[PDB]
Every structure is written in structure tokens, then in C-alpha cells.
């Protein structure tokens, strides 16, 4: 077919009739309640998605320096792109396919593997209307569909795709994305030089409501929160980088402690030698951190390619599928195997859960870790993520009730550890709603169940920032002194007010349990 710039595999989805194999929809109805449409489409507007062409032009989100780079497609190795999906609408899934095929040279694209993770939508089912399979006949033979007869989850489906890939390199993409030009060449070139590099593109945004292409998505340097979820470097963390790295060139690759997950390229052979995925992970969540920690610890390197840009629909006001509530908690328990003594803090943050994390299966993972020679999480913190606020557990000197003995009451998050509400005073009962922890590097006073919520002298919790707005000092006499104003927190009259610091005033004296975790985290029973 007619191949050229913008259609590197030719004109896609055209019948012998000469008409598209896909009938676009009319403009979305004017009487459209965006919240309701964000539900029908599982987190994005399917009315507008269905109206938009599959050969959708996207702006080049790449910095001008990236286009001045040349690539030799005859020296690069081929790559198998793997898109897995569970109940993804037709318009988004097939626009992701068109974007890849249209924006990836055939010289470097071995195959495009579609992995149906036990979908139930009629347009996907094998006993359905055959919409997808019939439409795949109108696409290159590179494109291949394989199926999990029962939904296994992200890890289950990505393994089915990876194991089936035949290229030495594989690239995983979500099923609701659009690429910027030359998205794959920077990844291949980087892994060609060292097979131990797992390289992830910079992610951009497609608005779930309007489908506008947005410049900034996720970025490069990514840390993690103690709720076990990736977290982009905040300003005070970038400030801790070596000065030669606080503002790198738009083309230089950068290392990242963590990845966003599902958008990374890797040498197939090294991916299996470094542990692949923990296939006892369930459905959705946290496999990106288990992979990130295991990668750095066991001889791998995680890098971000600022010149490899992919647009991504971040779901808003909705969700595309339903995961069991306990599957995420399990995945976090299995991830804590790689955090060594630090699992005590993470386990306390996610609420001291007692779930079935397949303990027998995790012990075989422990053995694998020792036999591979993987390094500790302390090494990881001190050498991979040394800019975090908790590098050793000595950075968390307090964890427990903040109790004022005068009135005999503890601080209480009042049910919502989430930011934006007021702290209170209540009779102490020991529950997690009354435990607070202290991050000394930023003077943050947080509820143990959310390290994004910080105490403020206003008496209310708010989003944590590494600035003087949130810095507290805990004096040797028991005072909570807001450093910026040198005023102390008082519990006088069962209200929280800032007063002039006087260590002879019992209403501003607080007791706070010291955090002295054991050298080893002993998992809870089942």
C-alpha cells in the first residue's frame, strides 16, 4: 500500500471496497453530561474518541534538539511492540495501533502483538460479533492477536505477550496512547549499546474529556511514596541532585529510581535474567515498583528517554475495569520483599494489612533474590534514590500518637488522612487515626496513612511540599515549633492554636513515640 512519512506501514484499515474498515461516529451530542460520558467510557469520553479518526495527527512533543539526531535503521535491532488490553474500546485500541504502525519504520518493527486479557466486550470476544478480528485482516501481517482465555491481569497479560515476542527487544505500550515521531529509535539505540538498560519514554497527556494533546505527562526522574506508588521528583528533591544533573540537556538520558509501568523497552533475554515479572502479582497495581527495585538491585539500569515521547489518556472520573480490592494490597506486600527493613514503614503506612500474599510463593522469590546476588534496599536508597526524604529509617525518628498529657488527648486525623481537612483532639485509643510520623529532612508531620498530607500551623492537613510552609521542629522539651515563625503548637481549651514558645507551659508539651524499627522485617502470618 501507499507508504510514506506519517504512514510508514502504508494506508491502514482500507477494504478492497476502497472505504475504511471503521465507520467513524458523528460529532458527540450537544446534550452530553461529561461526568456521565466519562462513566460510559470507563474513564474517558468515548463519544469524542469514536468521532476522531484513527489516523489522528498528534503534535511533535519532542524538544527541537531531538529532531537533529540521526538514526541508522540498518544497524538497529528489531523490536516487538506489545499492547495488552482488557475491555478497551475499539476507537482507542485501534488508534494506538494506527499510531504505532504509522509512526514506526518497518525496518525496526518486528511485530505488533495484541494481548486480549480475557475481554468480555462483544467486539473482542471470540464468540462475539468479530469486529476486531475482521478489522485486523485489513492491517499488516506484522499485527498479531493472542488471547488469555481468562483475565490474568497486567503481569499475566504482559508475560503472555513478552514470551510470544520474537525480537531481541520488546516494547510495552498501554492500549490508549499516541506516539510522537521517532518514538522507538531512541529506545533501540540505547539498549543496543547495553542490554542491561530498561529504557522508558517520557509520557505526555491526552485529555480524557476533550482529547487535547498536552505537553507534560509524567517526566523523567521518578521516586516513590511510602504508600508504594511512583512519585515524580518534587522541587526540593531535584535540588538535592548533583548540580551537573539538576538541569540536564533535553537529549541526555537520565536514570530514574522508578518507572511509571507499562511504557518501557527492554532486551528480552536480560528481562528474564533479571527476574522478569513476579507472576503472582494479581490484576492491577504496583508491579512497576517491584520491577524497579528488583532492576536496580540485581544489575540493571532504569533510564528515561526525553526524546521518546508517547501520549497517554489518564483516566479521569472513572475507571475502565474492576480489580478485586485485595489484589492491590497483595501486590504491595510482595513488593515489600525488596524493601528489606524499610518494609516496616511501608507496611505501617498502607495500614498494617494482614492479607494472603501467597507466602509460599514469595519464599521462592526470596531464594531467587539471594541466588542472584541482588543488593539491599539500603544500597538502593543511598545510591539510586539518595534524594528521598527517608534514606535510612533514622530519617523517621518519631512514629506514634502525638499526645498532650495536660488535657489527656491525642491528635486525630478525624477519619480522613487525606489532605484538606482539619486535625482534632480526641481521647487516645491507639488506632492508626491517631498515629503521626516525622520526616526530619523536611520537618514534615504526617498521618502515618498518607505521606502526602502534612500538618500546618493552621491546624489543618494539606498537600506536602518541601518548603518552609510545612517545616516543623520537635524540640527536646516536647514542643511542636513551626520553624518559620518560631511559635509552638498548644492544645489549650481542646483547640489547636499557635502560641509563644514556653517550655514551662504544659499545654504545648507533646509526647511522641520514637520509631526504633527492627533490623529485619518479619512478614505477617496468614
Amino acid at each position: 500500500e501507499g507508504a510514506g512519512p506519517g504512514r510508514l506501514h502504508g494506508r491502514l484499515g482500507i477494504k478492497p471496497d476502497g472505504q475504511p474498515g471503521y465507520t467513524r461516529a458523528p460529532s458527540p451530542p450537544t446534550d452530553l453530561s461529561m461526568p456521565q460520558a466519562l462513566a460510559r467510557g470507563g474513564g474517558f469520553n468515548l463519544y469524542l474518541s469514536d468521532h476522531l479518526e484513527l489516523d489522528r495527527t498528534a503534535p511533535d512533543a519532542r524538544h527541537a534538539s531531538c529532531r537533529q539526531l540521526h538514526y541508522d535503521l540498518s544497524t538497529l535491532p528489531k523490536a516487538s511492540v506489545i499492547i495488552v488490553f482488557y475491555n478497551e474500546p475499539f476507537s482507542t485500541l485501534m488508534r494506538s495501533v494506527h499510531s504505532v504502525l504509522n509512526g514506526t519504520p518497518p525496518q525496526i518493527l518486528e511485530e505488533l502483538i495484541l494481548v486480549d486479557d480475557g475481554s468480555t466486550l462483544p467486539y473482542i470476544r471470540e464468540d462475539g460479533n468479530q469486529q476486531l478480528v475482521e478489522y485486523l485482516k485489513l492491517l499488516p501481517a506484522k499485527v498479531r492477536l493472542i488471547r488469555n482465555e481468562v483475565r490474568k491481569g497486567i503481569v499475566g497479560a504482559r508475560m503472555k505477550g513478552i514470551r510470544a515476542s520474537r525480537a531481541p527487544i520488546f516494547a510495552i505500550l498501554d492500549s490508549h496512547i499516541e506516539v510522537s515521531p521517532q518514538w522507538l529509535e531512541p529506545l533501540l539505540l540505547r539498549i543496543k549499546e547495553d542490554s542491561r538498560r530498561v529504557v522508558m519514554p517520557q509520557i505526555d497527556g491526552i485529555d480524557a474529556e476533550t482529547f487535547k494533546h498536552i505537553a507534560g505527562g509524567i517526566g523523567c526522574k521518578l521516586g516513590f511514596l511510602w504508600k508504594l506508588m511512583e512519585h515524580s521528583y518534587e522541587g526540593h528533591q531535584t535540588a538535592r541532585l548533583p548540580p551537573e544533573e539538576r538541569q540536564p540537556s533535553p537529549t541526555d538520558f537520565q536514570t530514574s529510581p522508578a518507572m511509571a509501568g507499562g511504557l518501557f523497552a527492554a532486551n528480552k533475554a536480560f528481562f528474564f535474567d533479571v527476574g522478569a515479572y513476579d507472576e503472582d502479582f494479581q490484576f492491577w497495581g504496583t508491579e512497576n515498583l517491584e520491577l524497579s527495585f528488583r532492576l536496580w538491585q540485581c544489575g540493571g539500569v532504569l533510564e528515561c528517554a526525553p526524546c521518546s515521547r508517547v501520549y497517554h489518556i489518564f483516566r479521569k472520573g472513572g475507571s475502565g475495569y474492576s480489580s478485586p480490592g485485595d489484589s492491590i494490597t497483595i501486590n504491595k506486600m510482595r513488593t515489600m520483599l525488596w524493601m528489606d527493613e524499610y518494609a516496616d514503614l511501608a507496611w505501617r503506612v498502607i495500614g498494617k494489612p494482614r492479607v494472603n500474599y501467597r507466602p509460599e510463593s514469595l519464599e521462592k522469590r526470596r531464594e531467587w533474590r539471594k541466588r542472584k546476588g541482588c543488593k539491599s534496599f539500603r544500597w538502593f536508597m543511598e545510591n539510586v534514590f539518595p534524594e528521598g526524604d527517608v534514606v535510612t529509617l533514622d530519617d523517621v525518628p518519631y512514629l506514634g500518637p502525638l499526645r498532650n498529657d495536660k488535657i489527656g488527648m491525642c491528635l486525630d486525623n478525624m477519619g480522613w488522612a487525606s489532605p484538606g481537612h482539619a486535625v482534632g483532639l480526641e481521647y487516645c485509643h491507639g488506632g492508626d487515626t491517631q498515629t503521626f510520623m516525622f520526616f526530619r529532612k523536611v520537618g514534615h508531620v504526617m498521618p502515618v496513612n498518607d505521606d502526602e498530607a502534612c500538618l500546618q500551623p493552621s491546624g489543618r492537613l494539606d498537600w506536602c511540599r518541601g518548603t518552609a510552609q510545612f517545616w516543623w521542629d520537635f524540640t527536646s522539651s516536647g514542643q511542636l515549633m513551626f520553624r518559620e515563625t518560631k511559635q509552638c503548637l498548644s492544645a489549650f481549651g481542646r483547640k489547636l492554636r499557635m502560641v509563644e514558645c514556653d517550655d514551662t507551659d504544659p499545654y504545648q508539651i507533646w509526647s511522641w513515640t520514637a520509631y526504633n524499627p527492627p533490623d529485619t522485617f518479619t512478614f505477617p502470618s496468614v
Binding site: 507534560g216 489518564f314 475507571s319
Partner: peptide, 7 residues
Amino acid sequence: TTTTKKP
């Protein structure tokens, strides 16, 4: 079932 966009 959602990873959030960087601020």
C-alpha cells in the same frame, strides 16, 4: 486502576 499524571 489509574496512574496519575505528573503535576
